[PDB]
């Protein structure tokens, strides 16, 4: 029989031990240790120089936690007690108790410099200011996860009688605006793999029936999530809700398989923390405990790469066997052009709506454009070698720099395709007319 749970992102179960992590992210991590019927909570940072690490005794059993650059929020799901602790001492630590119905429990909490949110098993949404003053109350499908950035908030909802779904909204000073509300989520539930209920796995899924390791906004403010498919998913076109679509941008199983030399090693797992441009920030976990353990390892990094390869063909092309596979130029150029295109489009959306957030992204986009045309030229040259005039000409239309088109003319001449040379220069004339206009 199914059962609802309280949850916090990137924390861990106890296993059999007396300690666990409550939440973890690129700014820091929260850990706790059991001291008889009392608990010690510690807030740690990946910049302890800026932010004092601090610890205190939890006499309440806080089972919910949220960490940001200003403070840490704690919650007790049964009693409804909550507590906020700023990292500084300019702002006070403060506590509050939230009303709860019989059998109702707080399922998730979130806090930003401009908004605070609480959710419950009976689908009630409550919002507050940074002092705990209430703003509003709303009724939804049951809420199972929350995350936020400035006024932007992303929520996940689930019921057997309404399905699995999400909401995207911005709690602006004008009003709460819904981009999407309780729209179906295209993510594989862990219980689809019903037969994998081994003892070590069963503890984790009793701790986290949803299976999701984390959910967060990108460095560019885009929603992202990592599920039981061991794949990182990113929501594209979220700023344009008519056009929104989820993209699988990185599979950890494929990467670890390749990194092992194309081998099925059952021994290493990835714990995600945050996505920064093209690179996932994550912790590498090993062995039966698929959740990270104590002492916490040092963080690692991994690049996003598109799911566009076949294992058997990769092994046959590769044919020191543990060294990562040698990928053909065709496959490499293919994935490069797709990844360049995806990254350029997402960054374009970022800059067109929110501007330069770091002050250099124009350079990144220019570099991506160079990589894109160069990838296409590799694929074009391969097509010319195959003498497929139509496919070669189709690829020519996708280039962006006239310099690449000129290179394509030279390639066509080497390929001895005068018809293709003629048609490419017709395209260059057409683009020159477009450049004149």
């Amino acid at each position: 029989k199914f059962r609802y749970m309280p949850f916090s992102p990137a924390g861990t179960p106890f296993g059999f031990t007396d300690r666990r992590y409550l939440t973890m992210n690129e700014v820091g991590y929260v850990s706790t240790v059991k001291n008889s019927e009392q608990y010690s909570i510690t807030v740690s940072f990946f910049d302890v120089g800026r932010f004092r690490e601090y610890h205190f005794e939890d006499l309440f059993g806080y089972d919910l936690c949220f960490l940001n650059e200003k403070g840490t929020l704690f919650g007790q799901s049964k009693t409804g007690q909550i507590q906020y602790r700023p990292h500084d001492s300019i702002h006070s630590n403060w506590t509050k108790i939230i009303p709860l119905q019989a059998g109702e429990r707080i399922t998730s909490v979130a806090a930003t410099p401009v908004r605070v949110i609480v959710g419950t098993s009976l689908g009630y949404f409550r919002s507050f200011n940074q002092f705990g003053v209430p703003f509003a109350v709303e009724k939804t499908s049951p809420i199972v996860a929350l995350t936020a950035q400035n006024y932007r908030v992303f929520s996940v909802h689930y019921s057997q009688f309404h399905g699995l779904s999400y909401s995207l909204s911005e709690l602006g000073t004008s009003s709460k605006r819904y981009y999407k509300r309780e729209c179906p989520l295209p993510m594989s539930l862990p219980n689809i793999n019903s037969d994998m209920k081994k003892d070590a796995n069963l503890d984790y899924y009793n701790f986290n029936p949803m299976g999701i390791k984390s959910l967060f906004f990108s460095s560019y403010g885009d929603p992202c999530i990592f599920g039981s498919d061991n794949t990182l998913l990113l929501l594209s076109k979220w700023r344009s809700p008519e056009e929104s679509k989820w993209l699988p941008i990185l599979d950890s199983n494929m990467e670890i398989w390749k990194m092992s030399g194309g081998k099925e090693t059952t021994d290493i797992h990835v714990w995600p923390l945050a996505l920064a441009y093209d690179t996932l920030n994550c912790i590498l976990v090993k062995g039966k405990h698929i959740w990270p353990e104590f002492p916490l390892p040092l963080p690692s990094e991994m690049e996003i790469r598109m799911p566009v390869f076949v294992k058997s063909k990769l092994l046959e092309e590769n044919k020191e066997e543990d060294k990562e596979i040698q990928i053909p130029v065709s496959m490499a150029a293919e994935e490069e052009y797709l990844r360049s295109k995806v990254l350029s489009e997402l960054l374009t959306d970022t800059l067109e709506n929110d501007g330069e957030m770091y002050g250099n992204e124009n350079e990144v986009l220019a570099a991506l454009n160079g990589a894109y045309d160069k990838a296409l030229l590799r694929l074009f040259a391969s097509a010319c070698s195959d003498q497929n005039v139509e496919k070669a000409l189709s690829l020519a239309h996708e280039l962006k720099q006239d310099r690449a088109l000129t290179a394509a003319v030279k390639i066509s001449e080497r390929a001895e395709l005068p018809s293709l040379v003629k048609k490419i220069n017709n395209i260059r004339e057409a683009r020159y007319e477009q450049q004149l206009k």
């Binding site: 160069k374 030229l377 040259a381 690449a404 290179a407 030279k410 390639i411 080497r414």
Partner: peptide, 10 residues
């Protein structure tokens, strides 16, 4: 054909 690519890099 690699020299036209090395062209395309430069």
């Amino acid at each position: 054909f690699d020299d036209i690519l090395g062209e395309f890099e430069s």
